[PDB]
């Protein structure tokens, strides 16, 4: 059996892992593909845990579209969108 909280936690970790790897240039074009897939599929951008990477994620063309700059803050929403996937929102 699989528990909602742990699987959401795991998917979020996998995303962070892909994000960190995608941000450093090399054969890590697989990580860049995964990140692009997650961003496009979940209509998100960035990690709420690994927030420091955001500028590097933007500069690596991983978030071409989608407004993340709300009010006067850029909010990283992938961890939320992952939560919404497993919640049904």
């Amino acid at each position, epitope marked *: 059996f699989v528990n909602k909280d742990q699987i959401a936690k795991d998917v979020k970790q996998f995303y*962070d892992q892909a994000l*960190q790897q995608a941000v*450093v240039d090399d054969d890590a074009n697989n990580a860049k593909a995964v990140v692009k897939t997650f961003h496009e599929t979940l209509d998100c951008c960035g990690s709420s*845990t*690994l*927030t*420091a*990477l955001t*500028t*590097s994620v933007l500069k690596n063309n991983l978030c071409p579209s989608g407004s993340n*700059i709300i009010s*006067n*803050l*850029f909010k990283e929403d992938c961890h939320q969108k992952i939560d919404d996937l497993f919640s049904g929102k």
Partner: single-chain antibody
Amino acid sequence: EVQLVESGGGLVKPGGSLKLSCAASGFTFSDYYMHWVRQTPKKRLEWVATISDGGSYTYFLDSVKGRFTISRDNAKNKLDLQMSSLKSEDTGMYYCARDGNKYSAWFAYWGQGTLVTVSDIQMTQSSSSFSVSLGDRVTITCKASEDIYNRLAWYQQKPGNAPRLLISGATSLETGVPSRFSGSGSGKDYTLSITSLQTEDFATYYCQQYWSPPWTFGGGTKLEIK
């Protein structure tokens, strides 16, 4: 309950080498990115290195790149900075710091420091010092060279001691930080306001941006009594 103890100093020859080590305790070491921030003799704060939670990812200050190396032992709860090809610019107190979250580049906890003696977003703090009396009110200003999207921290530092985090995300006070401290601002302009100045409040105040690396600090604003 968080503790960081740094060993490895001090006196070294130009071109020389040193091996700084930090001994973490009181939190889950494996869950945080760890950093090295140095304070120059002219009391200027400067971030130098970052190691990822797992250890596989490494970030460095351009001036230390290729001379400095980072490592960590999650089993031994320890972090190391291997310094080589040392220059005069490298002199200062070396603080070991735990990240506020996994990797947001603000420093929630710092160690006492190890002295190392050897022989870009501009963060502008208008006033180097302010002469204010007890019970007074102050507003310390911090200006950014570009929009830093409220990704700003404020540190208090009394002499002898290391910097202590007051505010993160421009406005959010840390736990155990009194109501008299407040942070406001947006884009490039930020402020730290202290009302009803008490005695413990006289110290040097720094702002730091954590939007784009290198994580630059302000010059500081020292509050002196009169």
